[PDB]
Amino acid sequence: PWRYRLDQFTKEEQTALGALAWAFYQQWPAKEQYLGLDLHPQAHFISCAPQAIAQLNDQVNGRIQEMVGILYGYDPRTEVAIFVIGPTQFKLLFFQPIPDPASCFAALGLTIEELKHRLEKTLQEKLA
Amino acid sequence: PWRYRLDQFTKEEQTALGALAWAFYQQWPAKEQYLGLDLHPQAHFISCAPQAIAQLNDQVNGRIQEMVGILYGYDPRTEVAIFVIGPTQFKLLFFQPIPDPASCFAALGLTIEELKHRLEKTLQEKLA
Amino acid sequence: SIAVGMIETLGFPAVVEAADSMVKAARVTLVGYEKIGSGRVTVIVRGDVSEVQASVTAGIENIRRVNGGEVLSNHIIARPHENLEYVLPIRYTEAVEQFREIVNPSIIRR
Amino acid sequence: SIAVGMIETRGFPAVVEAADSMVKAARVTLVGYEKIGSGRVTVIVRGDVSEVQASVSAGIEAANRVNGGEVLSTHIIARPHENLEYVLPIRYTEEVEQFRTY
Amino acid sequence: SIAVGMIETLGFPAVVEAADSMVKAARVTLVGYEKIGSGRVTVIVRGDVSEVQASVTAGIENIRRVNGGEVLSNHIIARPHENLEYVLPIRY
Amino acid sequence: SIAVGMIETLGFPAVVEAADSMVKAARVTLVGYEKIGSGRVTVIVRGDVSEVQASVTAGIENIRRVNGGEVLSNHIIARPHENLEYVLPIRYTEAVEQFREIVNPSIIRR
Amino acid sequence: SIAVGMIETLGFPAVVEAADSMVKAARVTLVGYEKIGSGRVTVIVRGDVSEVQASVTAGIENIRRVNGGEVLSNHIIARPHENLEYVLPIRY
Amino acid sequence: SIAVGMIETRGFPAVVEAADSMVKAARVTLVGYEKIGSGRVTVIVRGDVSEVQASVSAGIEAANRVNGGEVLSTHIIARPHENLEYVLPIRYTEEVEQFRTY
């Protein structure tokens, strides 16, 4: 069950994911890009403009309506909102870390390359 | 089981039973005796006073209460009411024949002994 | 001739007193207990028409014994003839086999 | 025979307190919880008539002490007919057999 | 033993606001809802009498914010007799 | 932050309009339809707390469109975070696969 | 093409006095009883429109003989559309 | 999309006449019968908004033609949001898929 691994990956890697989110948010501080995951061919992080995910919603007749609203409303200083692309479904990694994402990034002291490589290596092991 | 055989017996022999009931009623014009049926060892007709079945009702703590009320209330000119003693169960042969009991007795031209004998031969072969 | 007697109450304690009075006041059998919602409950007895009539009359008045008892409706319906059955608990087997001793195999007066 | 005691109320919290007080005030067994609609619920106890009487009285007074409690009707039958046992839900169930005394 | 707390409301949204406030205010086990007609629904929890008391109190005051919600009754039993566990729906 | 919005009505057509209006007025998911008897029915939506607020508001206002619609109660409850899931019918596989062709995998600005 | 007859009463004894009369007054098939709340119960029968009409008329007449009973509504549809058979409880 | 039309009556005989008139007056498919208590029952039809509008209008007038018929509420939605189909009982079922001719 890949939908089960992501829930424990979210619970276990809560600090590193918050450390990746804020650093990504530092690159796009006006929500120019949403942070996301693509599980195929293997788990790797991706991004998209908010307009892209809104148009996909129109194509699917508003079946990812709520995710577009959550992605529009979440506070990057307190919340992590990462969308996952499944085979023909979406999962939203959505949580409020302790500590805040900025504090997570300062605590781990890693750069965005290390956080990206570490989390993907770990997430691929949950799936593989 | 044997319960279904009595139902079919009551349906098939409603004229003979209506005749036997009328003949039995002629001997007790005030219902001083109730017509009954005992299946063990073989099915045979019996009789008892309206005191014996009510006494039995007290011994069973009023569990055959309705049967003694039906035996008390039935019109012999139009209704046949024959109690059957089973293993530890009591079943009524309760029906309104067409034609009425007296017409059944005149139609068949049989004696009460002939009615009792032949009816006691059909059910036995039906139970066995 | 048999019939069915029914008492509908607004409230469960009253319907229990109704059912208890009916089987105690006449020679009827409590056969059913129905619920249609909205606090309406009904108990049904079956037996000889005269017994049913006495059960229902003595079921309605005794509702007054219940603190909060209220009757909604009551009715009696004639029923077709039926080969009624009555199964006794196995502890009465000694009460049944001796009843066979008091009956005689002869149905002739003289 | 063994008596039957019943307390009917308007509201679920009051019926629980009634059942709790009845079963704590005397040697009775709570055997039934009956729902008939319109907010009317009844709790049913079985036991000795003198114990059932003490349970119902304690249940009524306690059900009134509940914030929002309202008792609708109340009845006791000392010697209920054997026919009622297997038609109305006033019977000893196997789940409450252990709590039965003699 | 294990206390029982009950809040009875008129209407489904108010009984949802009751349950959410009760679980969020103390370590109590939500055991379910009970519908008895006339729109009356009761939410039931189990736990320590101190925590159950904190749940019920946090349930009552938090319902008066529900637009259209009403509290009908509420009750706490510190030590419910074991007989009740096998007749009333207060465990599951 | 996500929340849950509820509208309870007295009548089924009104609850259908409430649900339809809530999912059209804001970005929420209709997650529930509950029945407690007595003609009281509730529809439940979930989504971003700002979206949920706009859904309930427009859901209550649009009941006026319903000939005979009547609102009984309404409430909004804050919900903890959750990794929400959305399964799409198999006919949207191409649309998802084309969106996968639009994203980029280099999330690091070089 | 098989007509449907319905008598809706307030109370259980009246709906039984409706059903038994409808069965005794003509050749109809008792479909069953429908409960919709507020003490409203409906008895449903099928058959020829002439037989259904006779049973409904006799059912309405006999309810006035019920102490406390009451007729709330009654209706007959001679040729109900086939669609209704798979949604409404009008068949056996 | 496919429109949805609803007629809610206080009384079951009236809701049957409402459903019968709707499917006889226009090209609509009776898909649902919903009971919410207190005597409130609703019949649901699906079809073109033009046919649904004619069917609902005919169902209302005939439901009041019933002895004791009482209409409580009525509503039509021309293009219901996709989310409604799998949460509310307004969906096409296989039992009525024969009467669906599109």
Q: What is the DSSP string of B67-97?
A: HHHHHHH--TTT-EEEEEE-SSEEEEEEE--
C92 close to D (CB below 8 A): no
- Alpha-carbon gap, residue F16 to H74, rounded angstroms: 11
Q: What is the DSSP letter of F103?
A: S
Q: What values do phi and psi take at H27, rounded to 5?
A: -85, 80
Q: Identify the helix (H) or strand (E) that includes residue D25.
A: helix D12-25
- Which residues, listed in sequence order, are joined to residue E75 by a DSSP beta bridge? E6
Contact C56, C77 (CB under 8 A): no
C59 close to B (CB below 8 A): no
Q: What values do phi and psi take at B121, rounded to 5?
A: -95, -30
User: How many CB atoms neighbour CB A109 within 10 A?
Assistant: 8
Q: Say which residue the tokens 């619609």 belong to.
A: F69
Q: Say which residue the tokens 């039965």 belong to.
A: D100
- Which residues, listed in sequence order, are joined to residue G30 by a DSSP beta bridge? G45
Distance, in angstroms, between C34 CA and closest chain G CA?
A: 8
Q: Identify the helix (H) or strand (E) that includes residue B38.
A: strand B34-38
Contact C98, D38 (CB under 8 A): no
- Alpha-carbon gap, residue C46 to E73, rounded angstroms: 42
Beta-strand pair E29-37/E3-10: unpaired
Distance, in angstroms, between C89 CA and closest chain D CA?
A: 12
Instruction: Give the residue from A50, A55, A54 showing the smallest Cα distance to A28.
Output: A50
- Alpha-carbon gap, residue A25 to F107, rounded angstroms: 11
Q: In what order do the strands lie in the sheet with E70-77?
A: E29-37, E40-47, E3-10, E70-77
E25 close to F (CB below 8 A): no
- Alpha-carbon gap, residue D40 to C10, rounded angstroms: 9
Contact H97, H46 (CB under 8 A): no
Q: Which of E40, E42, E84 sits opposite D19 (nearest CB)?
A: E84
User: How many CB atoms neighbour CB E1 within 10 A?
Assistant: 12
Contact B85, C96 (CB under 8 A): yes
CATH number corresponding to E3-86:
3.30.70.1710
Contact D31, D87 (CB under 8 A): no
CATH number corresponding to C2-84:
3.30.70.1710
- Alpha-carbon gap, residue D63 to A54, rounded angstroms: 57
Chains with ≥3 CB–CB distances under 8 Å to F: A, E, G, H
Instruction: Give the residue from D93, D72, D70 showing the smallest Cα distance to D6.
Output: D72
- Alpha-carbon gap, residue G52 to B9, rounded angstroms: 35
Contact G25, G58 (CB under 8 A): yes
Residue B62 CA, chain-centre distance (Å), reads 21
- Alpha-carbon gap, residue B127 to B42, rounded angstroms: 9
Q: What values do phi and psi take at B120, rounded to 5?
A: -70, -15
Q: Say which residue the tokens 């629980």 belong to.
A: D16
Q: Tokens in use for B98? A: 């067409």
Beta-strand pair C40-48/B80-85: unpaired
Instruction: Give the residue from F37, H30, B85 showing the smallest Cα distance to E12.
Output: F37
- Alpha-carbon gap, residue D67 to E75, rounded angstroms: 7
Distance, in angstroms, between C37 CA and closest chain D CA?
A: 5
User: Would you list the DSSP string of E11-62?
Assistant: SHHHHHHHHHHHHHHSS-EEEEEEEEETTEEEEEEEE-HHHHHHHHHHHHHT
A62 to chain H: which residues are within 8 Å by CB? Answer: 81-83
Max Cα separation, chain F?
64
Q: Resolution reached, in Å?
A: 2.5
Helix, strand, or coil (residue C56): helix
- Alpha-carbon gap, residue H12 to H5, rounded angstroms: 18
**Could you give the C-alpha distances from G19 to B112, C63, G78, H17, in angstroms and in order?**
42, 27, 19, 20
Beta-strand ranges (E) seen in D1-102 are: 3-10, 28-37, 40-47, 71-77
3 state SS for chain A: CHHHHHHHHHHHCHHHHHHHHHHHHHHCCCCCCEEEEECCCCCEEEEECHHHHHHHHHHCCCCCHHHHHHHHHCCCCCCEEEEEECCCEEEEEEECCCCCHHHHHHHHCCCHHHHHHHHHHHHHHHHC
> The domain F2-82 is classified under which CATH number: 3.30.70.1710, 3.30.1230.10, 3.40.50.1100, 3.40.50.150?
3.30.70.1710
Contact G69/C77, CB-based, under 8 Å? no
Distance, in angstroms, between G21 CA and closest chain H CA?
A: 18
Contact F105/A52, CB-based, under 8 Å? no
Instruction: Give the residue from A80, A123, A83 showing the smallest Cα distance to A101.
Output: A80
- Alpha-carbon gap, residue B36 to B18, rounded angstroms: 13
Q: What values do phi and psi take at B98, rounded to 5?
A: -125, 115
- Alpha-carbon gap, residue C41 to E61, rounded angstroms: 37
* Residue from F10, F12, F43, F66 whose CB has the most chain H CBs within 10 Å, to mutate: F12
Amino acid residing at C51: E
Burial of F64 (0-12, 13-18, 19+ CB in 10 A): exposed
Say how many CB pairs under 8 Å bridge C and E: 3
Q: Identify the helix (H) or strand (E) that includes residue B126.
A: helix B112-127
Q: Tokens in use for G51? A: 């037989």
- Alpha-carbon gap, residue G25 to B43, rounded angstroms: 40
- Alpha-carbon gap, residue B5 to B2, rounded angstroms: 5
Q: What values do phi and psi take at H86, rounded to 5?
A: -110, 20
- Alpha-carbon gap, residue C29 to C33, rounded angstroms: 12
Contact G47, G28 (CB under 8 A): yes
Distance, in angstroms, between C38 CA and closest chain B CA?
A: 32
**Could you give the C-alpha distances from A44 to A41, A111, A119, D14, in angstroms and in order?**
9, 17, 9, 58
Contact G37/H37, CB-based, under 8 Å? yes
A69 to chain F: which residues are within 8 Å by CB? Answer: 26-28, 47-48, 50-51
Burial of F76 (0-12, 13-18, 19+ CB in 10 A): buried
Q: Domain count for chain A, please give it.
A: 1
Rg (CA), chain C: 18
- Alpha-carbon gap, residue B36 to C89, rounded angstroms: 21
- Which residues, listed in sequence order, are joined to residue E71 by a DSSP beta bridge? E9
* Residue from C12, C24, C70 whose CB has the most chain D CBs within 10 Å, to mutate: C12
Instruction: Give the residue from B1, H67, F82, D43 showing the smallest Cα distance to A11.
Output: F82
Helix, strand, or coil (residue D98): coil
Domain that holds residue B85: 2-127
Q: Is the peptide bond before B41 cis (omega within 30 degrees of 0)?
A: yes
Helix (DSSP H) and strand (DSSP E) numbers for chain H: 2, 4
Burial of G23 (0-12, 13-18, 19+ CB in 10 A): middle
D3-94 is classed in which CATH architecture?
Answer: 2-Layer Sandwich (3.30)
Touching pair E, D by Cβ (3+ pairs < 8 Å): yes
Instruction: Give the residue from B2, B10, B40, B104 showing the smallest Cα distance to C105.
Output: B40
Q: Helix A65-73 and helix F49-61: axis angle, to 10°?
A: 120
Contact H88/F33, CB-based, under 8 Å? yes
Instruction: Give the residue from G19, F25, H76, B37 showing the smallest Cα distance to C107.
Output: B37
G68 close to C (CB below 8 A): yes
Instruction: Give the residue from A111, E42, A86 showing the smallest Cα distance to D17.
Output: E42
Contact G11, C72 (CB under 8 A): yes
Contact H75, F13 (CB under 8 A): yes
Q: Helix H12-25 and helix H49-63: axis angle, to 10°?
A: 140
